[PDB]
Amino acid sequence: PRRAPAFPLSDIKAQMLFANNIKAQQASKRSFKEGAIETYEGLLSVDPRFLSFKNELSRYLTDHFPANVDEYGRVYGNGVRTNFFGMRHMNGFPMIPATWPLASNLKKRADADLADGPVSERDNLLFRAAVRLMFSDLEPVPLKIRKGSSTCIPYFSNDMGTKIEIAERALEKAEEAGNLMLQGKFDDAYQLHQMGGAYYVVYRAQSTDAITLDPKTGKFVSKDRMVADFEYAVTGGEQGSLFAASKDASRLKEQYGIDVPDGFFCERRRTAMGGPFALNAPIMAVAQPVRNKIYSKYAYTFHHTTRLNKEEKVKEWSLCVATDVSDHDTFWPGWLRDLICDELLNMGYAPWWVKLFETSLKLPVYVGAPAPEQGHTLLGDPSNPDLEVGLSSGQGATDLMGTLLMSITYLVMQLDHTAPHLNSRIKDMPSACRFLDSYWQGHEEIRQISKSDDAMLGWTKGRALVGGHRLFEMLKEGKVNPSPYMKISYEHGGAFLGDILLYDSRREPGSAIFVGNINSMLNNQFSPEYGVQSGVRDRSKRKRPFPGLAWASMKDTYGACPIYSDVLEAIERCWWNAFGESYRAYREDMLKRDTLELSRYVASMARQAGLAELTPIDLEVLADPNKLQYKWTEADVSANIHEVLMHGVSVEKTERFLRSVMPR
RNA sequence: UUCC
Numbered sequence: 175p176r177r178a179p180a181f182p183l184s185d186i187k188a189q190m191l192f193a194n195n196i197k198a199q200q201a202s203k204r205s206f207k208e209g210a211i212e213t214y215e216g217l218l219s220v221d222p223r224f225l226s227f228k229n230e231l232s233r234y235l236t237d238h239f240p241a242n243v244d245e246y247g248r249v250y251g252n253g254v255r256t257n258f259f260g261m262r263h264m265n266g267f268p269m270i271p272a273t274w275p276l277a278s279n280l281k282k283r284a285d286a287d288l289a290d291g292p293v294s295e296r297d298n299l300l301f302r303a304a305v306r307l308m309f310s311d312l313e314p315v316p317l318k319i320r321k322g323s324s325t326c327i328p329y330f331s332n333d334m335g336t337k338i339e340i341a342e343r344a345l346e347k348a349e350e351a352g353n354l355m356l357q358g359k360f361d362d363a364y365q366l367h368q369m370g371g372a373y374y375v376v377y378r379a380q381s382t383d384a385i386t387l388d389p390k391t392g393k394f395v396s397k398d399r400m401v402a403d404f405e406y407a408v409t410g411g412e413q414g415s416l417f418a419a420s421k422d423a424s425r426l427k428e429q430y431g432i433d434v435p436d437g438f439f440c441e442r443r444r445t446a447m448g449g450p451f452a453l454n455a456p457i458m459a460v461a462q463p464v465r466n467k468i469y470s471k472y473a474y475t476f477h478h479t480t481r482l483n484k485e486e487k488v489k490e491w492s493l494c495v496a497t498d499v500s501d502h503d504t505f506w507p508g509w510l511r512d513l514i515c516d517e518l519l520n521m522g523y524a525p526w527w528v529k530l531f532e533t534s535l536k537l538p539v540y541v542g543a544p545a546p547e548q549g550h551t552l553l554g555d556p557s558n559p560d561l562e563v564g565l566s567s568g569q570g571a572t573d574l575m576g577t578l579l580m581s582i583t584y585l586v587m588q589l590d591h592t593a594p595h596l597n598s599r600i601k602d603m604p605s606a607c608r609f610l611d612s613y614w615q616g617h618e619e620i621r622q623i624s625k626s627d628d629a630m631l632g633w634t635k636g637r638a639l640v641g642g643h644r645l646f647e648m649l650k651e652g653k654v655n656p657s658p659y660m661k662i663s664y665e666h667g668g669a670f671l672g673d674i675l676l677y678d679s680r681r682e683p684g685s686a687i688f689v690g691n692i693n694s695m696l697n698n699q700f701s702p703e704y705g706v707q708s709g710v711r712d713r714s715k716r717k718r719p720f721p722g723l724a725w726a727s728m729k730d731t732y733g734a735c736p737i738y739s740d741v742l743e744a745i746e747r748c749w750w751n752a753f754g755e756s757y758r759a760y761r762e763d764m765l766k767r768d769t770l771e772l773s774r775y776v777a778s779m780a781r782q783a784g785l786a787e788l789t790p791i792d793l794e795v796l797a798d799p800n801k802l803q804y805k806w807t808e809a810d811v812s813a814n815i816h817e818v819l820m821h822g823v824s825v826e827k828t829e830r831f832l833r834s835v836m837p838r
Numbered sequence: 839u840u841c842c
């Protein structure tokens with residue numbers, strides 16, 4: 175309770191956030207904007223033929239293939255875990271009130287009965303152990319930058335050249351600034367090395383949310399989505415309201431003269447931080463090496479590539495629970511940040527860098543335009559970083575923050591309800607590192623596989639096993655939250671990292687298999703999160719460089735699905751039905767075309783040799799480079815293919831930097 | 839042209 179400082183774009187504090195160039199300026203002023211997307215080149219998400227197709231196809235599947243999810247959120251049968259009404263959105267038009275970020279989430283947490291720090295000393299050691307194991311013996315790698323991404327505040331450059339400069343410069347003066355912040359001279363810090371200021375709110379829209387058909391009425395329903403209005407966000411819950419955004423698509427007709435079929439809605443719009451690159455870089459410089467560690471040494475619980483690779487691990491469990499956290503980001507504890515920095519200091523990380531890290535995690539945020547007639551407000555004074563927004567997504571290590579948190583959270587959920595007999599193994603700090611280390615390599619009778627908040631908890635034949643079953647039962651009755659840190663619960667129709675866990679009549683981690691989620695396929699093919707940006711000349715700077723290729727890796731990724739074959743026909747039909755064309759064909763050309771274009775961007779790729787030596791991963795990643803942020807890493811992607819989408823800095827330079835940072 |  176304090177009420178955070180807000181400033182209008184006019185205020186000098188806001189002005190200082192955007193540089194004296196066009197891109198910057200325009201970003202500061204950009205107003206609300208919506209509109210159809212080019213789902214595929216030449217086709218609009220709103221084309222009648224298409225909406226019609228979407229309407230027919232979505233009903234037919236929902237009708238003919240109802241989910242096969244048991245009383246325990248385990249999917250069996252057809253692998254369908256929910257209706258296919260996902261696609262019924264006007265991709266391009268967001269739900270309208272689109273939320274404001276909270277200046278502070280303490281009340282939010284408290285009011286949800288979640289701790290304001292480790293509750294037991296054990297946990298305190300476990301969290302710190304996670305910090306220890308994770309930032310331990312890190313090994314330097316080039317700092318790689320996504321091509322065509324915006325440096326955001328204060329420049330907003332798109333230019334790989336300019337970025338590499340900003341970055342190299344950053345790693346250079348990174349220490350200077352920061353020692354500057356230790357002195358509390360946050361402004362000097364930003365003015366001289368543009369490290370600070372604020373995050374720039376960016377609205378990644380999730381093209382498909384819950385939509386249902388009330389048999390009773392005959393009309394559809396959109397899962398209400400709660401959004402906090404300004405007053406709410408500034409007071410952190412104290413005043414203001416928190417209502418549902420308006421997903422009604424009818425407006426589209428009166429506004430833009432677009433025929434909106436019944437049961438079609440505006441999409442859900444998640445918000446996300448555009449991090450000040452000057453700052454975000456010195457962080458990524460360390461983040462990636464950490465990534466490399468946990469993904470290697472602790473690959474059992476952290477590195478998951480294929481649906482068979484996962485299957486392997488879960489096959490040996492005697493119990494497998496698919497957990498679920500909702501609104502992970504806004505709940506993320508401020509104290510885990512401070513805990514972490516503290517441990518990092520103890521471990522011996524240069525202060526200034528830790529100080530950069532900290533600041534990075536309590537920075538103000540500039541809200542663009544959440545709705546028509548809104549925004550252009552900067553929350554939190556940048557001269558004195560003190561926000562508690564939870565976990566600012568743009569941040570260089572947002573994925574590591576989410577795991578360091580939930581991994582320990584989950585293990586603690588297991589220690590708490592199924593393996594008391596294990597506590598004695600966690601006496602001092604070391605014992606903890608030792609134990610956590612074992613747990614992470616998948617060597618205890620309790621096991622885990624995760625990514626930030628997505629995970630699967632397992633128990634092997636042993637003592638805990640009986641406890642496990644109790645926990646699972648608790649999550650089903652779900653009248654009680656099993657954790658003191660986050661609100662956890664069982665995932666109805668459990669799946670991990672995009673593949674669905676398909677049990678059979680036996681219902682055991684043993685005879686169960688993993689299969690790509692079919693709905694995911696449908697959503698990806700007919701409900702892209704971004705359009706094809708045919709405007710953008712350089713395809714490697716687009717959100718979907720090579721849309722067409724995804725067709726190749728399709729049979730592969732979604733092959734294992736039970737009703738696969740069927741779906742492909744339902745489509746073929748419904749498509750041919752509303753277009754006269756054959757979908758199979760469409761994608762086949764698209765594939766052929768894109769395959770050619772690709773060879774232009776890939777060197778070794780003989781300027782016509784086939785997709786020959788490209789791995790499926792390589793494909794889905796070229797059709798969607800965003801997946802390189804979560805589901806895959808530099809290592810699971812073909813060498814040269816990675817160069818297409820990324821560009822790094824001289825190792826000689828990042829290495830020199832990494833050295834000055836880490837514990838001597 | 840708006841993030842990891």
Ligand SMILES: Nc1nc2c(ncn2[C@@H]2O[C@H](COP(=O)(O)OP(=O)(O)OP(=O)(O)O)[C@@H](O)[C@H]2O)c(=O)[nH]1
Pocket residue numbers: 378446499500501502503567568569572573576626627841842
């Ligand atoms: N930088 C970034 N991270 C993202 C983005 N989307 C999801 N994430 C990552 O995903 C996590 C959020 O978990 P999700 O399951 O996607 O969503 P959520 O906000 O937790 O809650 P629900 O969507 O309601 O289940 C965070 O830890 C973020 O780091 C995005 O657009 N940008």
Ligand SMILES: Nc1nc2c(ncn2[C@@H]2O[C@H](COP(=O)(O)OP(=O)(O)OP(=O)(O)O)[C@@H](O)[C@H]2O)c(=O)[nH]1
Pocket residue numbers: 572573576625626627628671672673691693694695800803804805842
């Ligand atoms: N850093 C980051 N993490 C993400 C992003 N999207 C998802 N994640 C993380 O990865 C997990 C699985 O993400 P999902 O969106 O459920 O799965 P998916 O592989 O994209 O498959 P679909 O269901 O088809 O969208 C999440 O729990 C998040 O923590 C993203 O843009 N950035």
Ligand SMILES: [Ca+2]
Pocket residue numbers: 498499500501502627
């Ligand atoms: Ca979640």
Ligand SMILES: [Ca+2]
Pocket residue numbers: none
């Ligand atoms: Ca996703």
Ligand SMILES: [Mn+2]
Pocket residue numbers: 496497498628629665668669670671
């Ligand atoms: Mn899951």
